[PDB]
Amino acid sequence: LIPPLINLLMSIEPDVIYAGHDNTKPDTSSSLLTSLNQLGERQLLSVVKWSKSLPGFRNLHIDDQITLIQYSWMSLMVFGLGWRSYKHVSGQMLYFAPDLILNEQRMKESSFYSLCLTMWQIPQEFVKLQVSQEEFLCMKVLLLLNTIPLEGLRSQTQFEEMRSSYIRELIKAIGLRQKGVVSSSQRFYQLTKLLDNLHDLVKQLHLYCLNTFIQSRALSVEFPEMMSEVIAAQLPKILAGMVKPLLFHK
Ligand SMILES: COC[C@]1(OC)CC[C@H]2[C@@H]3CCC4=CC(=O)CCC4=C3[C@@H](c3ccc(/C=N/O)cc3)C[C@@]21C
């Protein structure tokens, strides 16, 4: 059977979110970026709601909660994207939403082809490692907890306890399918290494995002209120390396 905390995590996963994109009109650079931002605003709102039901999280100081959402949002959404593309279209298309799915041909014509390719690494890797939903749900929580300020958080003790709690839960998640100490131990390394590597992938998306933000009026891309808030609140500090990424390995 499934360990209780893992079962809870599945019950609090967000519902399907639509882009609201008008697919009865040809893709333009403007229209895609507008749709992706509208969709992202909605996904981040659902991440915030999610976090209010995530055990441990509401007991961190409110300022730590805000900071962790502001540090981790891009990671959470690209990781979510990865999981949907894996589960719904065998990882061979980018499943942003049910009404916004890019096959490779549509990616090629997007104007951010290589960004699509960067993002496409995750679901291909999911296919490769055959990640289970139980492993995914634990890893996703660890991403939320994967960077802290250089001075630490106000609720550092509680945070350490929460992060350790979810690391122990991933170790239980691995034990469900994988049998053998050797196999389980190596799988713990693989999954935690994947999380480590996401720091580098996310940095590329952060730089693309901030560049597009700066040039938004010339490019005619709308940046929503919360999106603009999180960008202005932490993105340059993050890109500058003025935060502490938490690595599982050397
Ligand atoms: C071409 O991309 C434009 C982006 O750069 C503009 C660069 C990376 C995009 C995010 C990639 C992950 C992602 C997954 C989704 O399923 C939908 C949203 C999404 C991205 C987009 C995004 C928009 C808004 C928000 C939060 N708003 O509150 C989050 C993500 C756009 C960027 C950042």
Task: Note the resolution in Å, 1 decimal.
Answer: 2.0
Binding-site residues, in ranges, read 84
Q: How many structural domains comprise the chain?
A: 1
Sign of the dihedral through C-alpha 96, 81, 47, 133: positive
Residue nearest to atom 33 of ligand 1 (CA): 209
Residue nearest to atom 11 of ligand 1 (CA): 78
Binding-site residues for progesterone, in ranges, read 84
Residues with CB under 6 A from ligand 1: 36-37, 39-41, 43-44, 77-78, 81, 96, 112, 115, 205, 208-209, 212, 224, 226-227
Q: Is 84 exposed, middle or buried (0-12, 13-18, 19+ CB in 10 A)?
A: buried
**Structural element, H or E, at residue 15:** none
Give the single-character DSSP code of 92. S
Cβ atoms 66, 234 nearer than 8 A: no
CA distance 155 to 229: 23
Which one, of 126, 188, 169, lies nearest residue 2 by Cα? 169
Mutate to test the pocket of ligand 1, among 37, 96, 203, 216 (most ligand atoms within 8 A of CB): 37
Calculate how far, in angstroms, residue 46's C-alpha sits from the geometric centre of ligand 1.
14
The b-or-e profile of 124-152 (16+ CB within 10 A means b, else e) is ebbeeeebeebbbbbbbbbbbbbbbbeee
The enclosing domain of 223 has a CATH number of: 1.10.565.10
User: Which tokens sit at 241?
Assistant: 């390396």
| Backbone phi, psi, residue 97, to 5° | -150, 170
| Amino acid at the residue 39 | L
CA distance 100 to 32: 9
Calculate how far, in angstroms, residue 196's C-alpha sits from the geometric centre of ligand 1.
20
Beta-carbon count within 10 A of 45 CB:
14
Calculate how far, in angstroms, residue 97's C-alpha sits from the geometric centre of ligand 1.
12
For β-strands 100-102 and 147-148, DSSP reports them as unpaired
The b-or-e profile of 93-102 (16+ CB within 10 A means b, else e) is bbbbbeebbb
Domain, as residue range, for 244: 1-250
Calculate how far, in angstroms, residue 205's C-alpha sits from the geometric centre of ligand 1.
8
Conformational region of residue 131, where left means phi above 0, alpha means psi within -120 to 50, and beta covers everything else: beta
User: Which tokens sit at 190?
Assistant: 């693989």
Which one, of 153, 150, 131, lies nearest residue 57 by Cα? 153
**Ligand 1 atom nearest to 228, measured from its CA:** 28
Calculate how far, in angstroms, residue 37's C-alpha sits from the geometric centre of ligand 1.
6
DSSP readout, 100-131? EEE-HHHHHTSS-HHHHHHHHHHHHHHHHHT-
